């Protein structure tokens, strides 16, 4: 008799194909309903899973007063228990006394993973153009042959070496300084004062609503940019935004749980900052029925022992991810400077060969 409303969400409620179609609750398989099954094994009761016909989320309507979404399946209290991805908003808390949230999270920014631009083993050749290097070699041969056939030539050679050292060091220092000045990522959670890396969120979603009703010095300018180019940055759904991020320089703003889910599904995306908003996901009941307190105490007794961590991991691992740097220093790498080692070894071995040849 305990009807539980559900909504199909990629990391929360899934309709597994399995081998053959099933009927009832066994066909449905997802993190939320699995947690409900466990707490039903703990707290003794039955539950019947019911989906929402409309499939939309619950929010205040501009010209109706009544709310569409699960609220349509909640206005007449036809859903005894409501588990779904539901941010605890002001109006939702006003009308539903939501239990303690399962998760605490907020909107977070998503970005394409900054690939390491490897310039090859011969990276030390960059500061001076190769033509200048050929000039250096021809000058070396010229000064050597002139010396073969002494104060003036020695002084001019020393001055030339002076100039070459100075120029090479100046170019390399300028290149490394401009590389280090700009951060490999954008201004973390501070895409203001940038106006070049286009950023956007879902169209008229929870993130869009939050940015609309925000007055912080960074987020108000972010919302101004949102509204200025709404037809471009805003996307219909999460997958379209992810595809746009993959195909072009685009920063998305999505729920943090979805950000970690996606960035763990594939390692081509990263979460720059995180928790730039305060909200939570937890179940509730439209009426002040006494069993929501039982739900809260079930949540507390489930959290007092370690069981939700493992299910959260096994649900949000997906495939593996290659190791990535966390505290790499500013020191030159082997891949960045190994060219001089290689050329020195080659020069040494050819010198030995031509010495033993005669």
Ligand X SMILES: *[C@@H]1O[C@H](CO)[C@@H](O)[C@H](O)[C@H]1NC(C)=O
171 binds, among a second copy, ligand X, none (CB under 5 to 8 A by kind): a second copy
Where do we find the tokens 């010396």?
147
| 15 strand-pairing partners | 28
Task: Kindly indicate which of the ranges 80-88, 123-131, 200-208, 264-272 contains the residues binding ligand X, using the contact rule CB under 6 A.
Answer: 264-272
Least distance (Å) between residue 49 CB and a second copy: 26
Residue 50, marked binder: no
Residue 188, marked binder: no
267 binds, among a second copy, ligand X, none (CB under 5 to 8 A by kind): ligand X
In this structure, what token pair is assigned to residue 97?
Answer: 């006394």
Question: Does residue 56 touch ligand X according to CB under 6 A?
Answer: no
As a whole number of angstroms, the distance between CA 313 and CA 45 comes to 27
Taking residue 255's Cβ as centre, other Cβ atoms within 10 Å add up to 25
243 binds, among ligand X, a second copy, none (CB under 5 to 8 A by kind): none
The phi and psi torsions of 25 (rounded to 5 degrees) equal -75, -30
289 binds, among a second copy, ligand X, none (CB under 5 to 8 A by kind): none
As a whole number of angstroms, the distance between CA 43 and CA 125 comes to 69
As a whole number of angstroms, the distance between CA 281 and CA 102 comes to 5
Task: Tell me 125's DSSP state.
Answer: T
- Three-class SS state of 236: coil
Taking residue 152's Cβ as centre, other Cβ atoms within 10 Å add up to 7
As a whole number of angstroms, the distance between CA 119 and CA 250 comes to 25
358 binds, among a second copy, ligand X, none (CB under 5 to 8 A by kind): a second copy
Site map 83..112 versus ligand X, x via CB under 6 A: -----------------------------x
Instruction: Decide: 276 and 106 in contact? Cβ < 8 Å.
Output: yes
268 binds, among a second copy, ligand X, none (CB under 5 to 8 A by kind): ligand X
Site map 168..187 versus ligand X, x via CB under 6 A: --------------------
Residue 255, marked binder: yes
Cα–Cα distance list, 137 to 5, 113, 123, 160 (Å): 78, 41, 19, 13
Residue 85, marked binder: yes
As a whole number of angstroms, the distance between CA 281 and CA 212 comes to 21
As a whole number of angstroms, the distance between CA 159 and CA 332 comes to 29
18 vs 243, beta carbon nearer ligand X: 243
Residue 328, marked binder: no
Task: Kindly indicate which of the ranges 155-163, 165-173, 265-273, 285-293 contains the residues binding ligand X, using the contact rule CB under 6 A.
Answer: 265-273
Residue 206, marked binder: yes
Least distance (Å) between residue 248 CB and ligand X: 7
In this structure, what token pair is assigned to residue 340?
Answer: 């001089």
Binding to ligand X (CB under 6 A) within 236-255 occurs at 246-247, 249
Nearest Cα neighbor of 315 from 28, 22, 30 is 30
If you compute the radius of gyration of the chain from its CA atoms, what whole number of angstroms results?
Answer: 31
Binding residue for ligand X, selected from 18, 129, 144, 268, defined by CB under 6 A: 268
Q: How many CA atoms lie within 13 A of 114 on its CB side?
A: 8
Taking residue 109's Cβ as centre, other Cβ atoms within 10 Å add up to 25
Least distance (Å) between residue 24 CB and ligand X: 36
- Site size for ligand X, by CB under 6 A? 9
Instruction: Decide: 265 and 11 in contact? Cβ < 8 Å.
Output: no
Task: Kindly indicate which of the ranges 18-26, 235-243, 261-269, 300-308 contains the residues binding ligand X, using the contact rule CB under 6 A.
Answer: 261-269
14 vs 172, beta carbon nearer a second copy: 172
18 binds, among ligand X, a second copy, none (CB under 5 to 8 A by kind): none
Least distance (Å) between residue 178 CB and ligand X: 14
Least distance (Å) between residue 213 CB and ligand X: 32
Residue, CB closest to ligand X: 115
Residues in binding site: 85, 87, 92, 206-207, 255
Residues in binding site for L-glutamate: 85, 87, 92, 206-207, 255
């Amino acid at each position: 008799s305990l009807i539980v409303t559900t909504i199909l969400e990629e990391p929360y409620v899934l309709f597994k194909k399995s081998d053959k179609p099933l009927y009832g609750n066994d066909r449905f398989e997802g993190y939320c309903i699995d947690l409900l099954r466990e707490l039903s094994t703990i707290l003794g009761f039955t539950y019947e899973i019911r989906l929402v016909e409309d499939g939309k989320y619950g929010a205040q309507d501009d010209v109706n007063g009544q709310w569409n979404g699960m609220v349509r399946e909640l206005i007449d209290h036809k859903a005894d228990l409501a588990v779904a991805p539901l941010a605890i908003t002001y109006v939702r808390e006003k009308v539903i006394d939501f239990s303690k949230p399962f998760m605490t999270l907020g909107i977070s920014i998503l970005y394409r993973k900054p690939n390491g631009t490897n310039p090859g083993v011969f990276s030390f050749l960059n500061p001076l153009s190769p033509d200048i290097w050929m000039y250096i070699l021809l000058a070396y041969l010229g000064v050597s042959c002139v010396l073969f056939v002494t104060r003036i030539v020695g002084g001019i050679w020393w001055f030339f070496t002076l100039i070459i050292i100075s120029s090479y060091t100046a170019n390399l220092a300028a290149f490394l300084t401009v590389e280090r000045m700009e951060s490999p990522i954008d201004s973390a959670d501070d895409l203001a004062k940038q106006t070049k890396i286009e950023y956007g969120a879902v169209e008229d979603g929870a993130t869009m609503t939050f940015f609309k009703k925000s007055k912080i010095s960074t987020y108000d300018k972010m919302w101004a940019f949102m509204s200025s180019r709404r037809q471009s940055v805003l996307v219909k759904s999460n997958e379209e935004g992810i595809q746009r991020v993959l195909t072009s320089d685009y920063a998305f703003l999505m729920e943090s749980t979805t950000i970690e889910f996606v960035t763990q599904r594939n390692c081509n995306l990263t979460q720059i900052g995180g928790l730039i908003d305060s909200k939570g996901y937890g179940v509730g009941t439209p009426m002040g029925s006494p069993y929501r307190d039982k739900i809260t105490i079930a949540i507390l007794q489930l959290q007092e022992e370690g069981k939700l961590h493992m299910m959260k991991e096994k649900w949000w691992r997906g495939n593996g991810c290659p190791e990535e740097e966390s505290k790499e220093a500013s020191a030159l790498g082997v891949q960045n400077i190994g060219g001089i080692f290689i050329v020195l070894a080659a020069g040494l071995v050819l010198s030995v060969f031509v010495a033993v040849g005669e």
